[PDB]
C-alpha cells in the first residue's frame, strides 16, 4: 500500500484531474438497448416500395441460383431505405451477378483444394492451367507421365471430354462433396466466410455426417486389442379422437 | 515510463491483478495505435471527414471482428448469436429420447467405428 | 399461492379441471382455407399462417403471435389453451 501512494503521485496533476473527472459520468443507463428490444419484440410514399422486398422468394426457398432478374428486383428497396430517391445505375444488376458468381466460385475452390488429390493433368484443354492445382501421388504421376508421352506417338487418344484413360479412371472414383469435407476444411482456415458467422455455426452445430443413419453402431473398450478398441463385426375429446384429427390435419397440410 | 502506461497499470491493478508482466502495456498501446490507424484509413477512403464517415467505418468493421466482450441482456457477446435462434436449436435437439443403456455396458461402450481413433500409427 | 400443475400435463386433466368454461379459440377448416369465428377474411394453408396449423398438429403454444393474442385478451388455462375445431373440409 505504501508504494501505491508513490505510484499514484508519479503522475502529473493534469492527468490526475482527468482521471478524477470520471466520477461525473452518468453511469450506464444502457437506454440504447431500447431500439434493439423494440426491433426484436406533393410527397412520395417511400414505405410502399420497401415492403416489396419480402414478396420475392429467397434462393433457398425456390432453389434457383440468384440471377440478374432477382437481384434487380431486390435492389430498389435497399436504395429507398437508404434515401437514394433517384435509384440505381442501369448496369448494376449484371455487375452484382458477376460479383456473386466470383465469390461463390472462390469459396468452392477453397473448399476443394484441401480435400482432393490426383486432379486432371495440364496437357491441354483440362486441368487448372495457371490457377492453383491439387497434389499428385507418385504412382498417378508416373502413369500420367507415361500416358502423356505415349499420346504424342498417336498410340492412345483422349476421351470425349479430353481426359486420358488414367485421368478419367481417377475421376471415376471421386464422390460428391459432403459435410465432413466442409467441416475439415473449416478447421484449416476461414474459406472466405469470415463475415458469415451464422453459416459456420450452423455447420458446427449440426449432426455429424452419417450419424443419423448409423444411429446404433458402437464399439467397446478392450485393452487386449492393439488400440484398446474392440470392433464388433366437452365434444370430440382429444384422448380418443387424436388419431383422426392428426390424420385430417396431415391431409390438410399435404 | 511513458504516459498512459502508468495509467493502464493502475487501471489493471484496481481490478484484482496482483502481479504483471512488463511489455504488456506496450502491447496494449501498440494495439490501440494499430486499431486507430486502420479505422482512420478506412474512414478517409470512405469520404475533411465528418462524424458520419467515422461511424460508418466502425459499423463496417464490426461486421467481422470484435464479436465478444462482456455484454449482458441482448448484447452481442459470446459469438454474437441471437438467443431465439439458439432456443430453436435447443428445442430441436432436446426432443429425442436419451440413449438406452444396460448395466453391462454402463462405462465400456464407445461411439461408432467412424468416430474413433483406431489405427492412427 | 396458486395450485401448481403436475409433472406431466395431459388433455384429460386440463379439460376436466376447467370443464364448463368458454373455449380459448374456435377454428373452422375448409377445403383450402381456414378462419376464426369472428374473422371475416380467410387464411390459406400455403400462406404465412401455416405455422398455426403446424402448432396445432404438434400441440404447442404459438409464441410467434403472442402479442396479437394478448391484444385480444384470449383466455389461458394454467398456461395452456383449449381450441375448438370445426371440420367443414369433408
Amino acid at each position: 500500500e505504501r508504494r501505491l501512494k508513490g505510484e499514484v503521485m508519479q503522475l502529473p496533476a493534469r492527468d490526475r484531474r482527468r482521471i478524477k473527472e470520471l466520477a461525473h459520468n452518468d453511469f450506464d443507463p444502457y437506454d440504447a438497448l431500447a431500439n434493439v428490444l423494440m426491433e426484436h419484440a406533393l410527397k412520395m410514399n417511400f414505405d410502399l416500395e420497401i415492403r416489396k422486398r419480402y414478396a420475392q422468394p429467397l434462393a433457398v426457398e425456390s432453389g434457383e441460383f440468384p440471377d440478374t432478374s432477382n437481384i434487380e428486383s431486390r435492389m430498389l428497396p435497399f436504395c429507398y431505405e437508404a434515401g437514394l430517391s433517384s435509384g440505381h445505375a442501369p448496369d448494376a444488376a449484371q455487375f452484382m451477378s458477376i460479383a456473386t458468381e466470383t465469390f461463390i466460385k472462390e469459396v468452392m475452390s477453397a473448399i476443394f483444394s484441401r480435400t482432393r488429390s490426383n486432379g486432371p493433368g495440364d496437357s491441354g484443354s483440362a486441368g487448372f492451367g495457371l490457377g492453383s492445382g491439387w497434389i499428385q501421388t507418385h504412382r498417378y504421376r508416373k502413369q500420367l507421365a507415361k500416358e502423356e508421352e505415349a499420346f504424342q506417338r498417336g498410340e492412345i487418344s483422349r476421351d470425349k471430354m479430353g481426359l486420358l484413360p488414367v485421368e478419367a479412371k481417377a475421376a471415376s472414383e471421386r464422390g460428391p462433396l459432403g459435410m465432413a469435407d466442409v467441416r475439415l476444411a473449416l478447421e484449416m482456415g476461414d474459406c472466405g466466410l469470415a463475415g458469415f458467422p451464422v453459416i459456420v455455426k450452423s455447420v458446427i452445430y449440426g449432426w455429424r455426417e452419417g450419424e443419423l443413419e448409423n444411429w446404433e453402431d458402437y464399439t467397446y473398450v478392450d485393452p487386449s486389442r492393439p488400440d484398446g478398441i474392440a470392433i464388433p463385426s366437452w365434444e370430440g375429446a382429444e384422448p380418443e379422437t387424436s388419431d383422426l384429427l392428426n390424420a385430417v390435419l396431415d391431409s390438410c397440410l399435404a | 515510463r511513458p504516459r498512459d502506461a502508468r495509467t493502464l497499470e493502475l487501471l489493471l491493478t484496481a481490478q484484482g491483478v496482483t502481479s504483471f508482466e512488463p511489455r504488456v502495456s506496450q502491447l496494449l498501446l501498440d494495439f490501440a495505435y494499430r486499431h486507430t490507424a486502420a479505422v482512420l484509413s478506412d474512414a478517409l477512403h470512405l469520404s475533411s471527414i465528418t462524424a458520419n464517415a467515422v461511424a460508418l467505418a466502425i459499423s463496417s468493421r464490426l461486421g467481422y471482428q470484435f464479436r465478444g466482450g462482456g455484454g449482458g441482456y441482448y448484447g452481442g457477446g459470446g459469438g454474437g448469436a441471437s438467443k431465439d435462434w439458439m432456443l430453436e436449436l435447443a428445442r430441436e435437439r432436446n426432443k429425442v429420447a436419451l440413449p438406452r443403456v444396460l448395466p453391462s455396458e454402463w462405462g465400456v461402450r464407445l461411439p461408432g467405428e467412424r468416430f474413433v481413433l483406431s489405427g492412427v500409427s | 399461492t396458486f395450485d401448481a400443475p403436475p409433472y406431466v400435463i395431459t388433455p384429460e386433466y386440463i379439460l376436466k379441471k376447467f370443464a364448463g368454461h368458454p373455449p380459448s379459440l374456435i377454428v373452422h377448416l375448409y377445403q383450402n382455407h381456414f378462419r376464426f369465428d369472428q374473422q371475416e377474411g380467410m387464411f390459406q394453408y400455403k400462406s404465412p399462417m401455416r405455422i398455426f396449423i403446424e402448432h396445432l398438429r404438434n400441440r404447442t403454444v404459438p409464441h410467434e403471435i403472442m402479442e396479437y393474442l394478448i391484444q385480444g385478451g384470449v383466455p389461458f388455462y394454467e398456461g395452456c389453451l383449449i381450441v375448438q375445431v370445426f371440420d367443414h373440409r369433408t
Binding site: 431500447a34 428490444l37 423494440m38 426484436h40 419484440a41 366437452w234 365434444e235 370430440g236 375429446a237 382429444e238 379422437t241 387424436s242 384429427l245 | 438467443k83 431465439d84 432456443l87 430453436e88 428445442r91 | 400435463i9 388433455p11 386440463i14 379439460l15 373455449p23 402448432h55 396445432l56 400441440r59 404447442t60 403454444v61 404459438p62 409464441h63 403472442m66 402479442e67 394478448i70 398456461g79 395452456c80 389453451l81 383449449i82 381450441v83 375448438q84 375445431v85 370445426f86 371440420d87 367443414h88 369433408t90
Partner: peptide, 27 residues
C-alpha cells in the same frame, strides 16, 4: 361437421417471449 377439442402445452420460448414483451410495454 365433426367437432374436436384439443389442448396446447406451453414451452420455454413462450416464457422468453412473455418476459421480452413485458420489458418493452410502457405502463
Amino acid at each position: 361437421p365433426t367437432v374436436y377439442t384439443v389442448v396446447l402445452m406451453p414451452t420455454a420460448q413462450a416464457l422468453h417471449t412473455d418476459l421480452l414483451l413485458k420489458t418493452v410495454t410502457p405502463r
